[PDB]
Design a protein around this ligand. Structure first.
Ligand SMILES: CCCCCCC/C=C/CCCCCC(=O)OC[C@@H](O)CO
Ligand SMILES: CCCCCCC/C=C\CCCCCC(=O)OC[C@@H](O)CO
Ligand SMILES: CCCCCCC/C=C\CCCCCC(=O)OC[C@@H](O)CO
Ligand SMILES: CCCCCCC/C=C\CCCCCC(=O)OC[C@@H](O)CO
Ligand SMILES: CCCCCCC/C=C\CCCCCC(=O)OC[C@@H](O)CO
Ligand SMILES: CCCCCCC/C=C\CCCCCC(=O)OC[C@@H](O)CO
Ligand SMILES: CCCCCCC/C=C\CCCCCC(=O)OC[C@@H](O)CO
Ligand SMILES: CCCCCCC/C=C\CCCCCC(=O)OC[C@@H](O)CO
Ligand SMILES: CCCCCCC/C=C\CCCCCC(=O)OC[C@@H](O)CO
Ligand SMILES: CCCCCCC/C=C\CCCCCC(=O)OC[C@@H](O)CO
Ligand SMILES: CCCCCCC/C=C\CCCCCC(=O)OC[C@@H](O)CO
Ligand SMILES: CCCCCCC/C=C\CCCCCC(=O)OC[C@@H](O)CO
Lengths: 99, 92, 116
């Protein structure tokens, strides 16, 4: 409900969205296509969960606590691992596809 | 309801075993369903925190539940795309 | 932008570092994950199987980190509200254990079909 109107989410969304379109056009087999799409959708999923966690922390207050920062650091780490999994997925699958 | 969610899993698992597909297709079909559960469980956990922070509404209280529900939505969508693509290929 | 990434990549490193430093269980988990990838990378399998073997154990790490974040929130709130902090932790722990089960099963089935 109107969270999709922030810049960072739009660039993240459009990046993921763009990959799904690309994956939908590539001449690959079904299992590869599913994996190409799954890897980038997971990034969007995890980022949504990371932002959701961040919302809960900011909800509590602006006064800083060590665990408040750590929850955000762990959420970011989850996204990073997701992004790496996506790059690796496309790397392994689309290697030697152009030729 | 996780009660119906659990039976929904079994049905997908039963169908997955029913169809004459190889191990890779079988792992993809079921994992996608399992990812929904994981995200839902994670979303439900986030919700449990929000609800005890306060019984009041806040800009950030409801913003979390939306982003969490969005994550579940994206997971369910990915699951449908997977079952569509694979079954289409299987019955090609 | 380019500077958003440096800032976000920095929080990620603090996340992984703090998670590593604070628990032996996490360190041993990261080792188990790291090995599994190395093994997956060297196996003589097709590209989709390779990705499946890698992708799954990665998901374990992802869910682990997300859950650890959620745990940090309920500990932040304090002792008083504990009981629904308990349910949030129970839910998140289910997500972690499910993901690990999926990883274990996936590796079993796939390595079975290949070596068998
Ligand atoms: C920084 C050095 C390591 C970086 C590794 C990243 C890309 C390489 C991945 C593994 C390639 C090394 C050979 C292992 C392997 O894949 O065996 C498969 C074999 O069937 C043909 O290569
Ligand atoms: C209610 C709207 C839901 C989405 C609208 C319909 C989308 C059409 C198909 C579902 C996913 C297709 C994505 C993959 C694709 O385009 O390749 C198709 C081809 O691989 C079939 O094997
Ligand atoms: C500066 C623009 C960057 C664009 C993003 C990168 C583009 C990636 C791939 C471009 C080619 C699209 C795939 C076309 C293709 O493989 O053909 C599919 C097959 O059905 C042809 O009959
Ligand atoms: C080796 C060839 C790879 C070809 C491209 C594969 C890219 C796959 C996934 C990357 C898309 C991630 C989109 C989300 C994103 O970047 O936002 C996260 C970050 O900007 C927020 O801090
Ligand atoms: C185009 C951008 C590249 C981005 C960097 C990707 C680094 C991460 C993982 C590297 C794994 C790719 C190699 C996998 C592979 O298929 O080996 C090559 C082999 O198929 C050729 O015989
Ligand atoms: C021969 C086997 C096919 C017969 C069709 C019977 C289908 C029965 C159950 C299908 C799976 C149940 C769970 C899937 C599901 O609920 O997806 C809905 C999803 O959009 C979440 O609302
Ligand atoms: C060919 C028949 C099988 C179709 C399988 C398609 C898989 C789609 C979704 C899999 C996950 C099921 C999750 C069910 C769910 O969360 O719905 C419950 C809720 O929406 C009802 O209020
Ligand atoms: C050899 C390594 C295997 C392939 C992975 C290579 C890494 C490629 C791109 C990663 C850089 C993007 C950094 C994204 C990031 O900072 O995450 C943001 C997140 O933590 C908070 O939104
Ligand atoms: C194969 C692609 C991803 C490979 C990594 C899989 C899991 C990701 C990270 C595992 C934990 C890395 C954190 C290491 C770290 O920060 O330790 C610092 C500490 O030892 C300093 O004393
Ligand atoms: C908690 C248990 C998780 C354990 C994590 C580390 C062990 C997991 C997988 C490693 C066992 C694979 C052994 C088979 C293998 O490596 O194939 C050999 C292949 O290269 C044939 O030459
Ligand atoms: C925390 C981030 C750490 C990132 C770790 C980097 C990932 C390392 C290896 C993943 C890529 C494996 C490439 C597999 C490969 O090259 O084998 C190709 C072989 O089949 C040739 O036919
Ligand atoms: C077949 C053996 C059981 C395996 C369980 C896996 C089934 C799939 C999803 C179940 C997740 C369990 C989450 C339910 C739960 O924890 O509720 C209890 C707790 O949250 C408060 O009562």
């Amino acid at each position: 409900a109107a969270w999709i109107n922030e810049a960072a989410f739009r660039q993240e969304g459009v990046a993921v969205l763009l990959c799904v379109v690309i994956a939908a056009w590539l001449d690959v087999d079904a299992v590869t296509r599913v994996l190409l799409i799954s890897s980038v959708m997971l990034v969007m999923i995890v980022e949504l969960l990371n932002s959701a966690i961040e919302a809960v922390v900011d909800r509590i207050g602006s006064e800083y606590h060590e665990l408040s920062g750590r929850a955000k650091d762990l959420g970011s780490a989850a996204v990073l691992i997701a992004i790496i999994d996506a790059v690796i997925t496309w790397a392994i699958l689309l290697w030697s596809h152009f030729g």
